[PDB]
Amino acid sequence: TTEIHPSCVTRQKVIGAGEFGEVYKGMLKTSSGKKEVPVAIKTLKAGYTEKQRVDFLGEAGIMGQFSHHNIIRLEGVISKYKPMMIITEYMENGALDKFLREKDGEFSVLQLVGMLRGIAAGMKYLANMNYVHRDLAARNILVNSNLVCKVSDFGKIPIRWTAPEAISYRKFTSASDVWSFGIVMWEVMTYGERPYWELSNHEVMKAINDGFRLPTPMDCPSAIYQLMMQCWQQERARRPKFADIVSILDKLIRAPDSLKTLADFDVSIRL
Ligand SMILES: Cc1cccc(Cl)c1NC(=O)c1cnc(Nc2cccc(C(=O)N[C@H]3CC[C@H](C(=O)O)CC3)c2)s1
C-alpha cells in the first residue's frame, strides 16, 4: 500500500459526509509530479477508535491486493498525517443502484448484460483471490463515465441480498456471494427496483424459505432470468460458480439473438 504525501493531494468537492469522515472528489499528483489524476478521497475524523482505524486502514489494505478492471483501484493512503485518507480512482457515475434509477429504461439489454458480465468478472477474481465480499449489492458497485462497473466497498448485513445459509448460520462463502449476485442481476435488469418491495426482513426470509423467488423483470431475456434463478438455489452447492456466470454471460453477448427470447412478465382491459 503506497503512502501518499499530502502535498500530492487536493480536495475540490465534497461527495458525501458521515459522522466518521467525508468523501471528496479531488486530484492526485503521481509519477514524480509528471501526472495528475482525478481521485476519490475518504477521510477518518479525529477521535477515531482503534477498531475504526483497523477497519479503515484494513479496507485499503484489502483493496490494494487486487488488480482487476472490475475492481476499484486504490491509489494509496495517507496514514502518517491527519486526517487519514484512502485515495481511489474516481468513478464519475457513482453507485450503480442510484445511477440506474436515474437512467430508468435508457440502456439496451446488451448494455445491462455487459454491466453484469463486468461485475461477475470482478467477483470471479475476488473469489479466486480467496475473498468473500459478504455485502454484494448494486449500491456497492461504482460506475465510471464509460459505463464500466467495478466492485467496491470492502468495509448489519442487508438480509434481502444474503443467502439463506449466511443469514441463519453465518456461513458466508463465494457461493453466498453468488446468491447476492443473482439479486444484483435482478437490480440491474429492473433499473434499481428494491428487491422484495414492501416485505419486511422476516417476510423475505419467510418467502425465500417457502421457495418464493423474485419474479422476472420486465423485458428480461429468458436466459438471464434462468441464470439469476440458478444463483438462488437453496442448496449452495447447486449454485453456479462465478466462473460459470462469466462464461454464460460471454456466450450470450457473443450471440446476442439468444437474448431476444424473453421471459414472460406478469389488468387493463380495453380493445
Ligand atoms: C469505494 C471507496 C472505498 C474507500 C475509499 C474510497 Cl475514496 C472509495 N471510493 C469512493 O467512495 C468513490 C469513488 N468514486 C466515487 N464516485 C462518486 C460516488 C457518488 C457520487 C458521485 C458523484 O456523482 N459525485 C459528484 C457530485 C456532484 C459534483 C460533480 O462532479 O458535478 C461533485 C462530484 C461520485 S465515490
Curated annotation (Swiss-Prot):
Catalytic residues as annotated in Swiss-Prot or TrEMBL: 135
Gene Ontology CC terms: cell surface; focal adhesion; lamellipodium; lamellipodium membrane; leading edge membrane; plasma membrane; receptor complex; ruffle membrane
Tissue specificity comment: Expressed in brain and glioma tissue and glioma cell lines (at protein level). Expressed most highly in tissues that contain a high proportion of epithelial cells, e.g. skin, intestine, lung, and ovary.
Positions on the Cytoplasmic side per record topology: 1-271
Binding site for ATP: 15-23, 42
Disease as annotated in the protein's UniProt record: Cataract 6, multiple types: An opacification of the crystalline lens of the eye that frequently results in visual impairment or blindness. Opacities vary in morphology, are often confined to a portion of the lens, and may be static or progressive. CTRCT6 includes posterior polar and age-related cortical cataracts, among others. Posterior polar cataract is a subcapsular opacity, usually disk-shaped, located at the back of the lens. Age-related cortical cataract is a developmental punctate opacity restricted to the cortex. Overexpressed in several cancer types and promotes malignancy.
Function in brief: Receptor tyrosine kinase which binds promiscuously membrane-bound ephrin-A family ligands residing on adjacent cells, leading to contact-dependent bidirectional signaling into neighboring cells. The signaling pathway downstream of the receptor is referred to as forward signaling while the signaling pathway downstream of the ephrin ligand is referred to as reverse signaling. Activated by the ligand ephrin-A1/EFNA1 regulates migration, integrin-mediated adhesion, proliferation and differentiation of cells.
Protein name in the entry: Ephrin type-A receptor 2
